[PDB]
Write a protein that binds this ligand. Structure first.
Ligand SMILES: NC(=O)C1=CN([C@@H]2O[C@H](COP(=O)(O)OP(=O)(O)OC[C@H]3O[C@@H](n4cnc5c(N)ncnc54)[C@H](OP(=O)(O)O)[C@@H]3O)[C@@H](O)[C@H]2O)C=CC1
Ligand SMILES: [C]C1=NC([N])=NC([N])=C1[C][C+]123[B@]45[B@@]67[B@@]89[C@@]1%10B81%11B698B746B814B562B%10%1143
Length: 186
């Protein structure tokens, strides 16, 4: 795999989770952005792959698992098969990336999206080569118990804009946020 993508929504105090859910009330269009970015592939015959940790999998409501229109892969060091409804299980990110090149997934996977949580992001962000980080900055503090790893600015550059990503401050349910895209190359 020549490139990876991470996608996250983070509060101003770097929070991503609280009590097995998001720290902030649900933001419908922010969720639709996540859906659009992770689902969309114009390569006929392929789908995108989402990679997530075990707690993130179980944080998705049952009726919405697996995430529709995407191949769902869960990371765990302890499970011996995928959680019910998930398509694949790997012991690490590198194992997961190697899996996509074996006969079953060889001709089936377009983009790879890392969707959290903290340890999944941390590993992905140090993976060699080209990686983009799609980061929604929720412009408020929220009490959180799970946090997004620091963005190494020696490695990552904030892109001034990105095709298909809105540049202006957004607002839903009185909460302001903005969409950012970062990239590293080495
Ligand atoms: N705001 C946002 O964009 C997002 C928020 N969330 C929130 O974050 C919380 C869940 O995330 P978090 O608590 O960090 O937990 P994770 O989803 O990262 O799950 C942790 C478990 O996943 C497995 N795991 C995680 N990383 C790896 C790794 N790199 N290699 C192998 N296995 C791995 C382990 O399972 P095992 O113990 O079985 O080995 C580990 O105990 C929830 O509150 C959720 O709502 C989650 C994603 C994004
Ligand atoms: C809200 C949001 N927004 C975003 N820009 N990236 C993300 N990774 C998430 C977190 C998610 B996405 B959608 B819902 C919550 B559950 B499911 B999937 B799971 B992961 B977790």
């Amino acid at each position: 795999v020549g490139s990876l993508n991470c996608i996250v929504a983070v509060s101003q105090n770097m929070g991503i989770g609280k009590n097995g859910d998001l720290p902030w009330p649900p933001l419908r269009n922010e969720f639709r952005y996540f859906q659009r970015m992770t689902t969309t592939s114009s390569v006929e015959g392929k789908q995108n792959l989402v990679i997530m940790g075990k707690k993130t999998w179980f944080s998705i409501p049952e009726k919405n698992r697996p995430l529709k229109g995407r191949i769902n892969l869960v990371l765990s060091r302890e499970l011996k098969e995928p959680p019910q409804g998930a398509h694949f299980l790997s012991r690490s990110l590198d194992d997961a990336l190697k899996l996509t090149e074996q006969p079953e997934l060889a001709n089936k996977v377009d983009m790879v999206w890392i969707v959290g949580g903290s340890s999944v992001y941390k590993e992905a962000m140090n993976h060699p080569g080209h990686l983009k980080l799609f980061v929604t900055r929720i412009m408020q503090d929220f009490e959180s118990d799970t946090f997004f790893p620091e963005i190494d600015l020696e490695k990552y550059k904030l892109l001034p804009e990105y095709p298909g990503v809105l540049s202006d401050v957004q607002e839903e349910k009185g909460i302001k946020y903005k969409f950012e895209v970062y990239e590293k190359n080495d």
